Enzyme design. Structure first.
Site, PDB file in Angstrom:
ATOM      1  N   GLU A 154      -9.865   9.877  -2.133  1.00 37.06           N
ATOM      2  CA  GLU A 154      -9.105   9.126  -1.174  1.00 37.06           C
ATOM      3  C   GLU A 154      -8.248   9.963  -0.260  1.00 37.06           C
ATOM      4  OE1 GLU A 154     -10.202   5.327  -2.722  1.00 37.06           O
ATOM      5  OE2 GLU A 154      -9.254   6.014  -0.857  1.00 37.06           O
ATOM      6  N   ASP A 171      -8.574   2.844   7.194  1.00 33.69           N
ATOM      7  CA  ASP A 171      -9.498   3.382   6.248  1.00 33.69           C
ATOM      8  C   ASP A 171     -10.910   3.372   6.827  1.00 33.69           C
ATOM      9  OD1 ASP A 171      -9.874   0.572   3.781  1.00 33.69           O
ATOM     10  OD2 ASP A 171     -10.566   0.861   5.806  1.00 33.69           O
TER      11      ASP A 171
END
EC number: 3.2.1.17
Length: 164
Positions: A11, A20
């Protein structure tokens, strides 16, 4: 290598609100803030999550605290879901890490939808399950990450990350 280090690799860490891969407002170590398109809506969720006026920005400490909460909730969510817990309990320690990573990325519900793959993992048919897991929007959208997790279930080792 442990669950924390694995997810930190997958991540990343960002101290400012960001979008994202799916275009959603996120911050920290993969902490989704909102699926809403408003950066305003995101800033509000952020302040609510941290308990201060952040103005879109957080400290390392704050990101790690959100991360601790999210991993905890990912584990608790597997343990609470009947289908998930059955698989979880059947797996070795490394493979357990791979299912937690999926759950953190895609939510309980989403992972629970991988019916056939879950059955294969329970049965310890590693090669077959890896092939099945790759036939997914998940794999097509974020292939490098998905390949890392898939290898993890395939081998039961941390090779895919010992690179990284």
């Amino acid at each position: 290598m442990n669950i924390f280090e694995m997810l930190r690799i997958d991540e990343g860490l960002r101290l400012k609100i960001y979008k994202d891969t799916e275009g959603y407002y996120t911050i920290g170590i993969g902490h989704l803030l909102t699926k809403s398109p408003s950066l305003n809506a995101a800033k509000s969720e952020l302040d609510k999550a941290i308990g201060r006026n952040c103005n879109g920005v957080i400290t390392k400490d704050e990101a790690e605290k959100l991360f601790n909460q999210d991993v905890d909730a990912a584990v608790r969510g597997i343990l609470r879901n009947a289908k998930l817990k059955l698989v979880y309990d059947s797996l070795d320690a490394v493979r357990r890490c791979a299912l937690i990573n999926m759950v953190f990325q895609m939510g309980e519900t989403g992972v629970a939808g991988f019916t056939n793959s879950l059955r294969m993992l329970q049965q310890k048919r590693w090669d077959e399950a890896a092939v099945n897991l790759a036939k997914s929007r998940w794999y097509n959208q974020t292939p490098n990450r998905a390949k890392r997790v898939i290898t993890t279930f395939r081998t039961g080792t941390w090779d895919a990350y010992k690179n990284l």
